[PDB]
Point group: none
Chain length 28, copies 3
């Protein structure tokens, strides 16, 4: 018979890593 | 008609977030 | 008929959140 239709799109990827910590503030 | 295909592969991991801002001024 | 092909790869993940604020500056 004719081929089946395509499967559904895959799941969305995992969330990216949180950014790294900011540098120290200005001297006081 | 054949059966529907299986689900596609999972997407790529997202981009890393930006570095945080500078801390507050010192004392 | 033959099974359908696998579906397409999923979308890219969300970008990570901004990092935390830095520590206080020097005195």
């Amino acid at each position: 018979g004719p081929p089946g239709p395509p499967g559904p799109r895959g799941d969305k990827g995992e969330t990216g890593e949180r950014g790294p910590p900011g540098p120290p503030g200005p001297p006081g």
